[model samples]
Target: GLSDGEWQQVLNVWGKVEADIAGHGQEVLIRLFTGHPETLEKFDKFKHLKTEAEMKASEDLKKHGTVVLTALGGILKKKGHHEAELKPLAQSMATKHKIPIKYLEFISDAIIHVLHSKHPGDFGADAQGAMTKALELFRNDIAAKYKELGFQG
Candidate 1:
């Protein structure tokens, strides 16, 4: 559970990165694919991409990458004021993507890595821990929906 101050810190850091959602999101995705190459297998369109440059140039990658960053931004924005919205928002995405837990975990790690790389000064140990907790909660909420569907993933 993130404290109010922690949530604000996340939003502040995210605000800086959100300006270039496409670019930042692309980097996050590229990092994910680079670190956990198997995660790309889930995306039929992006799976065919060979090089990092090729993956960055991908239309589907751009679109979905935007979606990922957008959803993350929205979720972070609603953290304290709209707690009720979080679960449904994340669950909807989970239902839509049906991504496995492993891949979601991979993305989570990628997000942390991207934040650290993108904002080395602001995203310190405390900030990174907050974001990590928030991402984990979001992932768990989504996974809960899949569990309800007997997926057991």
Candidate 2:
């Protein structure tokens, strides 16, 4: 659950970086896969990519990364009006990936860290706190769905 002020904070900062979501999205994916190579094991096409340059140049990475980033964009768009809409979509992804809660938490951290890094001045404590709270809600939703379905990693 996010406070109205927190939600507004997220929208404000998120809009600041929305224009560069594609590149930022790709960067976040590359950073995650690079830092946690094991996470790429689930993506058949990307699992074979061993290095940063290879992953960065990967068409599969670009397309999938963009799709993911676009989903985030849409979720943010629904910030005030239909925030619950994010749950079903995220739950579906969770069922598909069937990864552990820790991996999901890893991604949440990656998103927050990447957003802050991409636009340091814009993502202050307020924005970070809001985004963190938002991710927790999403994570809890995904976790519950995965658990309910017995989809443990």
Candidate 3:
């Protein structure tokens, strides 16, 4: 968030991702969109979106399993530029050993750092959404991994 005069920098960076993804709250939106442009679309709504509205929408999407998409979007938005730095490492790791995509609390912790760095507010809501979504994605991934592991509750 910049002052009235410096707001363009924020918009220029975040606008791209906003249009592509729809349900992310402001903090996550800003964090992700700023970094990734392909999965997101640039728009003018960034400046006007309040955190509460984003939280509500994000929660609704979470209930519907859109959280993982949102999280990936955010990671791209916040860390996409670093892809040149991340891609090789991610690929190398994948090539060398098995990997698991469980909900790493520490992974969300990284997003917290992004939230704090980009926005000037509490990250509780965004973190909650991220963490919840991570777990949901993990469960889905796990279920996909082991199709026979079924249950009823």
TM-scores of the models, in the given order? 0.84, 0.87, 0.26
Give the winner by lDDT. 1
Across residues 101-146, which tens digit of lDDT does each residue of candidate 2 receive?
Answer: 8877888888887887788787888889998987787677777777
Stretches of candidate 3 exceeding 4 Å from the true structure: 1-71, 74-97, 102-105, 122-131, 138-153
Error of 1 at 47 (Å): 2.0
lDDT, residue 18, model 2: 73
Tens-place lDDT per residue, model 1, 1-153, is 788888877787787668888878888899989988877876777878999989877878878889889977887787745447666765554566556777878888988888778777877777787788778877776677667766543
How many backbone clashes does every candidate have? 0, 0, 8
Worst 10 residues of 1 by lDDT: 90-99
Candidates' C-alpha lDDT: 0.77, 0.76, 0.39
Against the true structure, candidate 1 has what lDDT? 0.77
Model 3 lDDT per residue over 1-153, tens place: 113323333333344335533433444444544344221322333333344456345544333224444545544344223335334434432333223232223334434454456544644464445444543443343334333322221
TM-score of 3: 0.26
Deviation (Å) of 8 in candidate 2: 0.9
Arrange candidates by lDDT, highest first: which order?
Answer: 1, 2, 3
